[PDB]
From TrEMBL, chain C:
It comes from Homo sapiens (Human). Immunoglobulins are composed of two identical heavy chains and two identical light chains; disulfide-linked. It comes from the Eukaryota. This is IGH + IGL c137_light_IGLV2-8_IGLJ2. Signal peptide: none annotated.
Amino acid sequence: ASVYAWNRKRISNCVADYSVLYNSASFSTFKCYGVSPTKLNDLCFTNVYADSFVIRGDEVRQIAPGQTGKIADYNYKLPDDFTGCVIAWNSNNLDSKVGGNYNYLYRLFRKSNLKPFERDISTEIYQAGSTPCNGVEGFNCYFPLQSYGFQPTNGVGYQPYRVVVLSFELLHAPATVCGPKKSTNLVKNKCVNFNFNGLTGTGVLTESNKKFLPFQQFGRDIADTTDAVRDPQTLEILDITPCSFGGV
Amino acid sequence: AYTNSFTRGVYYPDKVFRSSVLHSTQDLFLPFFSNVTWFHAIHVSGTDNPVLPFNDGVYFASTEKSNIIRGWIFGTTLDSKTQSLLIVNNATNVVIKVCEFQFCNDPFLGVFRVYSSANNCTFEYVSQPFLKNLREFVFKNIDGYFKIYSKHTPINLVRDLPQGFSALEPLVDLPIGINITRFQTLLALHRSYLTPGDSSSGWTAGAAAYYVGYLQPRTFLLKYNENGTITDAVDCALDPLSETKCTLKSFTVEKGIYQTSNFRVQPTESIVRFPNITNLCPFGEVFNATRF
Amino acid sequence: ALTQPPSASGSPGQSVTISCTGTSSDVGGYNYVSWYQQHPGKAPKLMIYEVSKRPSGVPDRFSGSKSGNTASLTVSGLQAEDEADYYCSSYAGSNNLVFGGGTKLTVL
Amino acid sequence: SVITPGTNTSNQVAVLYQDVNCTEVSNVFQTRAGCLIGAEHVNNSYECDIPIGAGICASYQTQSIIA
Amino acid sequence: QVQLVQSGAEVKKPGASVKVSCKASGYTFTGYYMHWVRQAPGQGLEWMGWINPNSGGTNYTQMFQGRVTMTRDTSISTAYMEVSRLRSDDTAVYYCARDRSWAVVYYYMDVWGKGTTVTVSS
Ligand SMILES: *[C@@H]1O[C@H](CO)[C@@H](O[C@@H]2O[C@H](CO)[C@@H](O[C@@H]3O[C@H](CO)[C@@H](O)[C@H](O)[C@@H]3O)[C@H](O)[C@H]2NC(C)=O)[C@H](O)[C@H]1NC(C)=O
Ligand SMILES: *[C@@H]1O[C@H](CO)[C@@H](O[C@@H]2O[C@H](CO)[C@@H](O)[C@H](O)[C@H]2NC(C)=O)[C@H](O)[C@H]1NC(C)=O
Ligand SMILES: *[C@@H]1O[C@H](CO)[C@@H](O[C@@H]2O[C@H](CO)[C@@H](O)[C@H](O)[C@@H]2O)[C@H](O)[C@H]1NC(C)=O
Ligand SMILES: *[C@@H]1O[C@H](CO)[C@@H](O)[C@H](O)[C@H]1NC(C)=O
Ligand SMILES: *[C@@H]1O[C@H](CO)[C@@H](O)[C@H](O)[C@H]1NC(C)=O
Ligand SMILES: *[C@@H]1O[C@H](CO)[C@@H](O)[C@H](O)[C@H]1NC(C)=O
Ligand SMILES: *[C@@H]1O[C@H](CO)[C@@H](O)[C@H](O)[C@H]1NC(C)=O
Ligand SMILES: *[C@@H]1O[C@H](CO)[C@@H](O)[C@H](O)[C@H]1NC(C)=O
Ligand SMILES: *[C@@H]1O[C@H](CO)[C@@H](O)[C@H](O)[C@H]1NC(C)=O
Ligand SMILES: *[C@@H]1O[C@H](CO)[C@@H](O)[C@H](O)[C@H]1NC(C)=O
């Protein structure tokens, strides 16, 4: 899709193998934010939004928090506290055609700067600065969209760069998306490191005597300590009390 | 008409078990004792079922054995141009569809799927249906997740919202992000016309009665009991006593004086005051000099 | 249409001018006055795109500026290269653009 | 600050805006500590049930909140 | 090289139709607007209308609205001007022109095609 009305997929309820991406040499920029590139396969994510657009080559630096520019303000704005990773690679031989390519267009004039993650399909003509324009482009009201016109003879800064941005928040369970890991058997009554669906901690696990409501993925005691969790494999409720410690 | 909300409309916010804990929650709850726009929706006379806004997510309830409330529709403009949602809660299954469909002048089922005229939908969902009985719902549309909460309690036929307390259990999370600003409920007699142009013809359905509120961002002090279910709540913005209850994180404020918040006068207006200088700086000279 | 004087005269190395009698009610209000130099038999080119701005490649010896209602383009130190027709144009208030009649530069 | 005679006694509450003139926001009594809104001024004098400041204390009239 | 290649000349019967085509080269076809202006062989120059290759929005003068239409072809990087009835007043050389401005609809005509001559017969 073009940079206006960028395609968004809501990736959820699957195991995500990130190892095929961050070790793949096909990508030009793999600048992640708020997460290490090599730790992506070892984490569980609440919801993963995958965006996709094609932009001009010199404009790939604008897709980053806090930047400014036409793409950054009128087409696609990342928030100031963005977490995720931005993936881009050159696509001059797939997105550009001989004599030109015109399926890719970008918004050039807008009355106001976009909110983060906003999407503006509105092709209504630009503000006049004068008497308003009924429906006709000209002299005050311009067409807000504009095609790059990608050509194979253009420089690397003008070549069509195909960009994918993965936006995803990393709270605890219920994590719909997590990386690949061999789930193993349950070890009760021992001081055991656990990774329950993204909920990570160290403690002993006891068969719980408390009754969860059928929606609660885990529980907490007073002062926000995670006292209980339900098993993602067999739906048993397990109490987590800390491993025994004390001064000697 | 209008009745008050007493204490109704609280729900489990975050799917986390707590027991014997007064947890201070901030979410789009129904503010206590607000007005709800109760409807004589039978509309044998007085053409009909109205379309209501969805300002920040709403609260819905009904009290009828006729079971005429059979679903809801949603959308930004409820037309074929923009996105929409249909929910139908027929006796077999719920069919939750995001379609950007073309809706009726006055929607109906008459089971016959009359409500949608043309469909090239994108998202669908089927699960178990929703069946003096008092149903309750809240519909939160936050950050791409459409959240429906539910509870139905055999109320004592008070012809309004009862003064009792009930916590809405979360029921369905829809992972669809569609801009929703208006909704309309769906009524269905067991047989009537399937023409999408009628308003007050075809059949006479049973007696109908439902409610609508609006959720506001409010702080709440939710009282989870021993078993882990909510039995009481305190709305921190309703009353200075309730604000004191939220400040102390306790449900019984004792004899004494208690500081509860800080009062500061917001500025009424903003003024800008510069001298009479109007001549412009010669940036036009220094940036357009013929030689440096 | 735009009223316009038909001709101007001179000799190579002199200074002459050509004027455009637009109406201040409709023509001069939205200015944007563009002058074009047209030899016979070939396409013309812009010679003052705004009311006073030359395009790239235009010699500096050509000057112009609106003056009240009328607009005028002047040629200083001309030669055999400047024997051409010259046309006035403007916005004319809405998308319906108008041109002038077209004066003819002549050198004795 | 609120004045509460106890939750299980009554739900009546009078508020006290410290160091505020009552020009900016049923009974509005201007104490020497601030705007005491909701309390009823009484010319009598008793023991100090709930202290307020500058020699004014509040109690439960029984039925009403007095200052 | 930013020269626009206009089509060849044509001769048409009176009252019949004719279409002229100007092919872009060098510059980006989408963007820069394309105005259509006519020059009678005797005198003057008149403006008809423009189409933008960016969006295909068209405007026309009043003298030609409802009797002459325009269209674009981004596949061949060319824009077409169509005349429905070749009246004897319209036997003229038709010129296509770019605009100086990037993507706004102003009127600053820089580069002009060689011009396809049109003739009304008898
Ligand atoms: C230094 O000289 C330059 C050269 O003229 C000045 O810049 C140019 O100023 C004109 C007149 O305002 C600008 O044209 C206008 O642009 C706006 C868009 O911002 C448009 O809406 C108007 O219709 C008009 O076309 C022009 O853009 C501008 N820049 C150029 C030519 O690159 C400049 O103002 C002078 N002073 C300084 C401090 O630079
Ligand atoms: C070209 O632009 C002009 C300028 O707005 C348009 O003229 C207006 O058109 C509307 C359409 O109904 C009329 O109501 C106005 O009265 C017109 N104004 C003037 C001053 O004529 C014109 O329609 C446009 N043409 C095209 C083909 O888009
Ligand atoms: C362009 O301007 C027209 C006239 O100024 C608008 O037409 C109007 O149309 C209504 C009914 O269609 C008439 O009742 C009214 O008198 C007027 O003629 C037209 O709507 C407007 N177009 C847009 C897109 O705003
Ligand atoms: C997951 O698989 C195991 C073995 O295949 C099975 O015992 C367990 O019940 C499954 N979990 C769920 C939630 O179905
Ligand atoms: C939702 O749609 C309405 C009507 O199209 C629009 O006015 C509103 O701004 C939209 N809201 C969002 C958040 O896009
Ligand atoms: C529905 O069809 C219209 C054209 O009739 C199309 O523009 C729109 O994208 C379609 N919506 C879908 C497939 O969700
Ligand atoms: C908790 O639930 C059990 C079984 O439903 C019930 O016996 C018990 O009384 C409940 N406890 C409280 C405090 O309501
Ligand atoms: C109210 O609270 C006081 C303070 O603890 C107590 O002495 C009194 O018995 C209570 N009265 C009732 C009716 O609960
Ligand atoms: C409060 O302000 C009003 C208005 O200026 C004044 O008349 C009054 O005396 C003030 N009271 C106190 C206690 O300052
Ligand atoms: C209290 O004293 C004031 C001031 O002297 C007087 O105006 C008022 O009437 C008195 N009220 C009572 C109940 O004595």
